[PDB]
Amino acid sequence: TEDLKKSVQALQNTLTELQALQLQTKQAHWNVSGTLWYTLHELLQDHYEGISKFADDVAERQLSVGASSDGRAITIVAASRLPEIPGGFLDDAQVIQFFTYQYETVGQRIHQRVGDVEKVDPTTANLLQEVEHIIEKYQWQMRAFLQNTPTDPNTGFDINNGKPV
């Protein structure tokens, strides 16, 4: 009977993480500030759209394997497992640092769910692989702002008041 239970756990846990990212990307989209604010405003809206699409796919896969989906605000708050994004005006370097970490953590967790369910539910595993793909792409897109190169360490001093990020 832990067939359905394992699939549900992986889908529901991924759903809540995506919804948390939905609210955080949108929050950063509105409030990000600094040299890169508009670049990140646009980039975060793209991430928001991709995350939102997969949140709907994950929720409906849960209904498809026969379980209701819990997307309520109390459930997002109850099932954090990750830091909250600060309120107020948000600096561009802070947004980059925040999602570099958040996307990496979410991607790692999905990666393990994939292995957990691939035996009993390869079609769910397939969907979670597609979520992992996009979250890891988004992680790269945040990582690349500070990626070291042969000619420049890209410390971020220029977007962080002269101090490395």
Structural contact between residues 111 and 132, judged by C-beta atoms closer than 8 angstroms: yes
Size of the site for Ca ion (CB under 5 A): 10
Based on CB atoms, which residue is closest to Ca ion, 122 or 157?
Answer: 157
H/E stretch holding 70 reads none
Check residue 99 for interaction with a second copy (CB under 8 A). no
151 SS3 class: coil
Q: Which of 101, 103, 132, 138 is nearest to 115 (CA)?
A: 132
First CA to last CA distance, the chain = 49
Residue 63 CB, nearest distance to Ca ion (Å)? 15
Size of the site for a second copy (CB under 8 A): 86
Check residue 83 for interaction with a second copy (CB under 8 A). no
Check residue 17 for interaction with a second copy (CB under 8 A). no
What does 20 bind: a second copy, Fe ion, Ca ion, none (CB cut-off 5 to 8 Å by kind)? a second copy
Which residue shows structure tokens 């702002």?
Answer: 145
Helical spans, DSSP H, in the chain: 2-31, 37-64, 73-78, 92-117, 122-143
Check residue 73 for interaction with a second copy (CB under 8 A). yes
What does 2 bind: Ca ion, a second copy, Fe ion, none (CB cut-off 5 to 8 Å by kind)? none
Check residue 34 for interaction with Ca ion (CB under 5 A). yes
Distance between CA atoms of residues 110 and 131, nearest Å: 8
Residue 56 counted as an annotated binding residue: yes
Q: Which member of 17, 59, 106, 116 binds a second copy (CB under 8 A)?
A: 59
Check residue 66 for interaction with Ca ion (CB under 5 A). no
Residue 165 CB, nearest distance to Fe ion (Å)? 25
